[PDB]
Amino acid sequence: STAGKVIKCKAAVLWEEKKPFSIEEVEVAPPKAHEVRIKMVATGICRSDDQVVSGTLVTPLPVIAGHEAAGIVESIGEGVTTVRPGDKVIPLFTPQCGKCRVCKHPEGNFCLKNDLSMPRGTMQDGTSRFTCRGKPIHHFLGTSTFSQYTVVDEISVAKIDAASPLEKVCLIGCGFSTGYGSAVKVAKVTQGSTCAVFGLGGVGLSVIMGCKAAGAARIIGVDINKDKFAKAKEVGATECVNPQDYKKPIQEVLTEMSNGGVDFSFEVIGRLDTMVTALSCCQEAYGVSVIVGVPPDSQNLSMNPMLLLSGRTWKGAIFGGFKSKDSVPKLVADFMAKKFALDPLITHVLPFEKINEGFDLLRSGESIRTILTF
């Protein structure tokens, strides 16, 4: 009988860029029509949430960040049909309305109801469910998972297996699905191909998992932090290279290593220069390069379109190209059936109250995924 009532609970509020989060009481309004209020159980720390703190991923502040999570439905608003109270759910930072031209397209996943392209930091109705110190607080990507309770639109939540371990499957809400799908769905990596993966964090490791699942013969991990190489090899990298070790640009190194360029490359960092390097290192006639990393806000890259004229394909994707609400429950079912592993991404576990310590671990280079438990 919190149904229909304001919930007071602890959240991690970001009042200002480049500051620690503030763990303090917020008010969470009850769900309106076609909204769902969720008791959070676990949430991952994704680099994207750090990019909000840095101001390189722009969204209105003050904000409740967090987008990679799982929890249990506390209550549903009028007209909700796809979840019920007590269901295990993953919030969907890329919604799936099922009605727009993108949701109807066989390839498209970047649903037109998204709050990513022109971020408002609201619910679909352009309002906020969060108050803190009597002030309205923004949502983030329609999820806001750094809170003991959040409210999401129905098109931004999926029901998952009632027996799911939420402290693992939260990663299906961002890192795992994004990297894995970038390899298997967006690039469509082929058997016996040579792949290069720039960035060996939680998302790059999931790209290597996808490239190994698709049968790549060679998977070259690229990182300036050599501490990341051991885990990259554990999940399928065949060799790792640190650009800092070489006199020549790493695109020339990777072209040499692959006897004329790789089949597939992935940028999984968020830098303009590595997006161009990753395109250049794929074979000039038939290579494919996928951008996964989030670039610094409003900045343009410079490149020579002759890289494309010879035959390269350049593409990007959100959330591994997966239609979110269709895909997430299937990915959970596949995890439950041991079709892929999440433990290699989880390097640290902390209670929610130690969220700043978890951000310090990511910023130091020491962690892949820290899972926060409520």
Ligand X SMILES: NC(=O)C1=CN([C@@H]2O[C@H](COP(=O)(O)OP(=O)(O)OC[C@H]3O[C@@H](n4cnc5c(N)ncnc54)[C@H](O)[C@@H]3O)[C@@H](O)[C@H]2O)C=CC1
Residue 26 or residue 208: which is nearer to ligand X going by CB? 208
H/E element, 206: helix 202-213
Minimum distance from CB of 242 to ligand X (Å)?
A: 8
Minimum distance from CB of 52 to its own copies (Å)?
A: 16
Minimum distance from CB of 173 to Zn ion (Å)?
A: 8
Burial class (CB in 10 A: 0-12, 13-18, 19+), 264: buried
Give the amino acid at 203: V
Q: Is residue 202 part of an annotated ligand binding site? A: yes
Contacting residue, 239, 304, 326, 366, with its own copies by CB under 8 A: 304
The phi, psi pair for 189, rounded to 5°, reads -55, 135
57 touches Zn ion by CB under 5 A: no
Determine the longest span between alpha carbons in the chain, in angstroms.
66
Residues after which the chain is broken (C–N above 2.5 A) are none
Minimum distance from CB of 128 to ligand X (Å)?
A: 24
Minimum distance from CB of 106 to ligand X (Å)?
A: 19
Residue 143 or residue 289: which is nearer to its own copies going by CB? 289
For the chain, the C-alpha Rg in angstroms (whole number) is 20
Close Cβ partners of 1 (under 8 Å, ≥ 6 residues apart): none
Residue 222's CB: how many other CB atoms inside 10 A? 30
Q: Is residue 281 part of an annotated ligand binding site? A: no
Here the tokens at position 311 are 């035959």
Q: Is residue 199 part of an annotated ligand binding site? A: yes
Contacting residue, 23, 132, 224, 308, with its own copies by CB under 8 A: 308
State the residues that interact with ligand X by CB under 6 A. Answer: 46-48, 51, 174-175, 178, 198-204, 222-225, 228, 243, 268-271, 274, 292-294, 309, 318-319, 365
**Token pair 């904000």: residue:** 63
Q: Is residue 108 part of an annotated ligand binding site? A: no
Here the tokens at position 58 are 């722009």
Minimum distance from CB of 50 to its own copies (Å)?
A: 17
Close Cβ partners of 227 (under 8 Å, ≥ 6 residues apart): 365, 366
141 binds, among its own copies, ligand X, Zn ion, none (CB under 5 to 8 A by kind): none
Q: Is residue 223 part of an annotated ligand binding site? A: yes
Q: Is residue 292 part of an annotated ligand binding site? A: yes
Query: Which residue in 32, 21, 317 sits closest to 145, CA to CA?
Result: 21
Here the tokens at position 262 are 């790789």
268 binds, among Zn ion, its own copies, ligand X, none (CB under 5 to 8 A by kind): ligand X
Annotated binding site for Zn(2+): 46, 48, 67, 97, 100, 103, 111, 174
Q: Which residues form the interface with its own copies (CB under 8 A)? A: 101-102, 105, 107-110, 112, 116-117, 259-260, 272, 275, 283-286, 291, 294-295, 298-318, 321
